[PDB]
Design a protein around this ligand. Structure first.
Ligand SMILES: [Cl-]
Ligand code: NA
Ligand SMILES: [Zn+2]
Lengths: 695, 4
């Protein structure tokens, strides 16, 4: 009302997206008008197409870029600022958007022009990045069904449309299920063991639900299923009945009634298999592997190698917990269950290493963590990062915005950071997303390149009262992880937009720079630069750092097996499993767990209903990508170990090489080749095993 | 999304 369609924020030229002025009401008109314009642009491209950059690749990027940026900003708002109105609007336009993506991807004039470039007599003279681009476009067109005759084509497109709808539904159900659970505790006794920080959070939560007399010390408390609330309960609640209840609630999220994801999963797997068959593959995992470094065989081999290396340690971890609980006179030591594991692990960790998480929190405040992280980035990669709040519109008052500068003081990139748990409207977990890519084609008139912009999103414990966000070590690692992704997007030296940043990096290599960054949390200079008391300003005592260092490999076997269980169940569901038979996804879960867990899952276990990585994310038949890339990240880190981590000259020289290979080259060179350029040789799994004490 |  009262504004023209032509003034819709989604239709404007912008440097930074209008995150402060876009809502549900803009989505239907904006997306539908945009799609009409992109249709006309595609028609013009197809009519004039030649196998050259100006006549094919440049006009293609302009179309792809506009849709990616605008849809990206809408989907980002869905992820961080969900509303019923925004859900409805996205649902309403999603089929039109998907129809256009299929139309574009299945363009025969575009595909034929790319094949002509591939078939050029001087192909070998084309730059590696441009060769990678052409090869990717050809492969992607076949994977989006371009080779199918019109009847099989129609079936393929119906499958794509339904999968898109189901993945959105899956994620909405997960958000809604996490949102729904509320445990009100009145009796002070039932919350025995919960530390001041958790009490302070549960009370702050109680205030927002009406209980205005609620304090941390005395007033009522609300327990929720988002991570910053859920974890402290499982770690610290002495009331075993409370642990079992909260555990069972977490484990059954989105698994019954209106929010049930079971049938959605069943349909997703059915459609994925139908898609695989249409494309001439045996199963969906083979489809997934087409764009990955791995094959089904090689992924399974790595998982089995890591599983074999982890099993004995995981068994010993279990025995250690039993022994410790028994030595405390704990009645449940004779019958330890899944709702005892986290609790007794924490008690064991406290006793064995003499470190208490609550006492560490004052040393890990977000502002100091960011300062230390930026200092590390300067040391390794030669970049200066500074606050730039006000330059770009944001969607929430807690969102930080930063400018990244090179050594000459020239901006090279920007990023947003949305750090705190906000379960009413914001997806759980942590992630990085692209905002705009580094691109020559999308540059402003006069300048050579559009600078890249990234999102980092975490869900860490929110600030309590007036104090800064005080963090756990895991939360620190999570920030370093997402920053690693942001760096690969931001520090890319490719100006070929379609292979810049993280684009066209085989999915099983994208977790390299992220997991790589996590290693530095244990690097003494880095940890000490971060760990300053938020009030006092005093540096973490040396003796405490040594305890943190000692605890690094605690339960590494168990942590490893847990990841391998996730990766193995993913692979199994997309290879051997056939939907529609008497066997359920939970039967698959039980079978795979025999070799990847020391005790069976509960029969009531419904973790699959919240496994968004594989049902509403990029990791379907691909969760193994974490461990695949962790071999790479650990080995990359071992180059610094070899060079001398106590030698700042060596650290900077090695950091520069990492900056100029892994962070610079995007998908413009095969990831194995990029890795070899950095490492000097092909990867070894020895560093990964050594770092985790599993040799 | 590059998750974690
Ligand atoms: Cl076609
Ligand atoms: Na492959
Ligand atoms: Zn990641």
């Amino acid at each position: 009302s009262d504004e023209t369609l032509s003034s819709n924020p989604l239709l404007q030229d912008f440097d930074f997206p209008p995150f402060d002025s876009v809502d549900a009401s803009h989505v239907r008109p904006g997306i539908r008008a945009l799609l009409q314009h992109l249709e006309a642009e595609l028609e013009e491209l197809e009519k004039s197409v030649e196998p050259t950059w100006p006549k094919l690749v440049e006009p293609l990027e302009k179309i792809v870029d506009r849709l990616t940026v605008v849809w990206g900003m809408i989907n980002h708002l869905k992820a961080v600022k969900d509303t019923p109105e925004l859900r409805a609007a996205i649902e309403d336009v999603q089929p039109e958007k998907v129809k256009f993506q299929l139309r574009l991807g299945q363009s025969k004039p575009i595909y034929n022009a790319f094949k002509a470039i591939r078939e050029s007599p001087d192909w070998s003279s084309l730059s590696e990045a441009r060769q990678r681009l052409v090869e990717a476009q050809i492969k992607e067109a076949v994977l989006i069904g371009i080779a199918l005759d019109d009847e099989k084509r129609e079936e393929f497109n119906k499958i794509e449309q339904e999968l898109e709808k189901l993945s959105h539904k899956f994620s909405e159900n997960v958000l809604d299920a996490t949102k729904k659970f509320e445990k009100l505790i009145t009796d002070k006794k039932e919350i025995e063991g919960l530390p001041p920080s958790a009490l302070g959070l549960f009370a702050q939560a109680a205030v927002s639900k009406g209980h205005e007399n609620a304090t941390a010390e005395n007033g009522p408390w609300i327990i929720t299923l988002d991570a910053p609330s859920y974890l402290p309960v499982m770690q610290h609640a002495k009331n075993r009945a409370l642990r079992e209840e909260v555990y069972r609630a977490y484990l059954s999220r989105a698994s019954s009634g209106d929010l049930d994801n079971t049938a959605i999963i069943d349909q997703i797997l059915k459609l994925r298999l139908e898609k695989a068959k249409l494309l001439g593959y045996n199963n969906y995992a083979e489809v997934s592997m087409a764009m990955k470094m791995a094959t089904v065989e090689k992924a399974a081999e790595l998982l089995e190698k890591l599983r074999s290396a982890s099993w004995d340690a995981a068994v010993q971890d279990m025995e250690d917990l039993k022994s410790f609980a028994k030595n405390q006179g704990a009645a449940e030591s004779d019958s330890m269950t899944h709702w005892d594991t986290t609790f007794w692990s924490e008690r064991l960790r406290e006793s064995k290493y003499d470190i208490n998480e609550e006492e560490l929190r004052p040393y890990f405040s977000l502002p100091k963590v960011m300062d230390g992280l930026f200092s590390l980035a300067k040391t390794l990669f030669g970049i200066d990062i500074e606050p730039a709040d006000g330059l770009a519109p944001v969607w929430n008052n807690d969102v930080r915005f930063y400018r990244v500068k090179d050594s000459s003081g020239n901006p090279i990139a920007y990023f947003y950071f949305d750090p705190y748990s906000r379960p009413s409207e914001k997806r759980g977990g942590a992630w990085m997303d692209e905002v705009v890519s580094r691109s020559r084609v999308m540059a402003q008139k006069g300048s050579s390149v559009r600078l890249p912009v990234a999102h980092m999103v975490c869900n860490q414990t929110p600030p309590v009262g007036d104090k800064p966000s005080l963090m756990t070590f895991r939360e620190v690692e999570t920030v370093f992880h997402q920053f690693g992704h942001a760096l690969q997007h931001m520090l890319t030296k490719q100006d070929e937009g379609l292979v810049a940043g993280i684009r066209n990096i085989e999915w099983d290599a994208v977790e390299l720079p992220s997991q790589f960054m996590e290693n530095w949390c244990y690097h003494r200079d880095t940890l000490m630069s971060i760990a300053k008391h938020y009030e006092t300003g005093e540096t973490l005592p040396e003796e405490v750092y040594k305890k943190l260092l000692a605890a690094r490999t605690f339960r590494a076997g168990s942590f490893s097996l847990r990841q391998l269980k996730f990766a193995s169940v993913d692979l199994e569901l997309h290879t051997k499993y056939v939907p529609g038979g008497p066997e359920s996804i939970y039967d698959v879960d039980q079978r795979v767990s025999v070799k990847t867990q020391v005790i069976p899952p509960l029969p009531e276990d419904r973790f699959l209903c919240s496994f968004s990585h594989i049902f509403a994310g990029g990791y379907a038949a691909g969760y193994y990508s974490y461990k695949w890339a962790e071999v790479l990240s650990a080995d990359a880190f071992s180059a610094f170990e070899d060079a001398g981590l106590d030698d700042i000259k060596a650290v900077k020289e090695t950091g520069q090489r990492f900056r100029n290979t892994i962070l610079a080259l995007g998908g413009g060179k095969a990831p194995l080749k990029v890795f070899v350029e950095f490492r000097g040789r092909e990867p070894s799994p020895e560093p990964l095993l050594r770092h985790n004490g599993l040799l | 999304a590059a998750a974690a």
